[PDB]
Amino acid sequence: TEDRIQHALERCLHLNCWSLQELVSRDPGHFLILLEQILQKTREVQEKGTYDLLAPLALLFYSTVLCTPHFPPDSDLLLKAARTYHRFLTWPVPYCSICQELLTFIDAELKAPGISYQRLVRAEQGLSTRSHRSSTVTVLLLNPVEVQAEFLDVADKLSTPGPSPHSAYITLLLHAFQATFGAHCDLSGLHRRLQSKTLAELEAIFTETAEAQELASGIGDAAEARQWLRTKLQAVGPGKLRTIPIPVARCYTYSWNQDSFDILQEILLKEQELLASTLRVVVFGSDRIGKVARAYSNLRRLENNRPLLTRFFKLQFFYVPVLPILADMLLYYCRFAARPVLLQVYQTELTFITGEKTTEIFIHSLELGHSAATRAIKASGPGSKRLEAVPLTLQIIYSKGAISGRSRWSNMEKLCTSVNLSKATEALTLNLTEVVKRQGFNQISTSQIKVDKVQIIGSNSCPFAVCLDQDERKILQSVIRCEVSPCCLPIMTFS
């Protein structure tokens, strides 16, 4: 068994994770052995200095210590782990910043065992108390026409309400009590006696148990915290240890054929009836489904400027490139992934023909002119039913920047129909369709130059239609000057 665990460990740090998290759960005894091995490898890194292999171990510890059915009082594994990870404070950021937040979790788990798994479960179910109330909701925004039927099945399964508040409270009480009293408790008798009890008394018992766990975690001394928690649980009240897995969290599956994230506020109406907190939006993603970032754009600024969803919830978006193994792996990722990845947003200063000014953001691209006009008519419908490109005379100053701070300037006056900006600090691939000769066909000279910063000035009598990030429905014309330079709801990545 030990050598099996070691092989799996050495093959998962190369669906190799799910198999680890499915082999340990068999025996209550497999959760300590694995942890011991992890510490050994971790210590090697601490001795060596191989910077690249720390974060997967720091995630495996957190993941296993939170599923470990119980830690024997004799075993001093947490102290050895804390001593091993205390010496990473001398490492470069972010390693010290993953270790500080692991040490805090290892103090929460040293003082009040099972607190970090009862917090998670409580939250995810929405069965919190009247003292520390919270909630988490999962929305599966999936396109019926793009997602596979296998993913549609997994989604349907996940959505199905499996547990009830009664069963959830029974599981929470069983795991809070087991984590403390190990085998020395009777989980069969406790379950049988808890089954006959009513929902309200179960809620009161869990609220007292959670308050005791939190208070014990708040006690300075670790040694007395465990004894105080044990005494409190005894007042509230050898066998075989039992693995209590994570109950499935609340999930909702909605058919998203759209691209804008307006759907979410429609959902928020049944949120008025379904109630800081957090919302786990699991976006399922294809190649073109580009436009998802464009929708992110709105839900970033729009909300930042018209807070509607953020009023109660902290949004978090998860990208899926598109119970069964996919269900387990999905829930595990969503649960244990907690570090976002913010993508760069370019800033544009626009002076209108009227003279007003307002900074904006193009995440994906910036089109202008014949492309902008074409998109304008694509967004017309009846208009496009009732409704060549004369060039737009623009003086454009583009600056190539560098970390050295030496910007190399260049400029030219041109008479080009359109100009689109496209993405490679970052580089901005740019296209300039010149009208070498105006006429219903204008000579087209696609010029690809690598600009990072740009300055466009158009004649007040030559308004130019401007599209940001290919948003065909909101093109901006009547602009006379445009200055472009490279400038909660995060998207998330496991590493």
Partner: protein, 114 residues
């Protein structure tokens, strides 16, 4: 191979701390010069170098040594054997433009109170 540029940087700054962050330095072009600790004033046609030193959540200080009695020299006070003394003194008798070979360095360092 022909050297074309150079630059230098203190790794501990003037207040007992290690260097951390992104640094862009200008390049002198090719002594007491090659041991210069200043940046080129010509910020218009000078080769520039950009480097990164990893950050740290806390300052990397450098304490002050504390003076402690060294018995390696205090109680080592009996005249050394005349042959080793002869070698030591014969070594010390050369000019400062005489490069100390590793052997001599080790001998002198062990005999660091004679």
């Amino acid at each position: 191979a022909q050297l074309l540029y150079y630059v230098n940087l203190l790794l501990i700054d003037h207040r007992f701390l290690l260097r951390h962050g992104e640094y862009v330095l200008h390049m002198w072009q090719l002594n007491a010069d090659k041991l210069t600790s200043a940046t080129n004033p010509d910020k218009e046609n000078s080769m520039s170098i950009s480097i990164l030193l990893d950050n740290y959540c806390h300052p990397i200080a450098l304490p002050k040594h504390r003076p402690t009695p060294d018995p390696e020299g205090d109680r080592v006070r009996a005249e050394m054997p005349n042959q080793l003394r002869k070698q030591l003194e014969a070594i010390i008798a050369t000019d400062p433009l005489n490069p100390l070979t590793a052997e001599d360095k080790e001998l002198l360092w062990h005999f660091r109170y004679e």
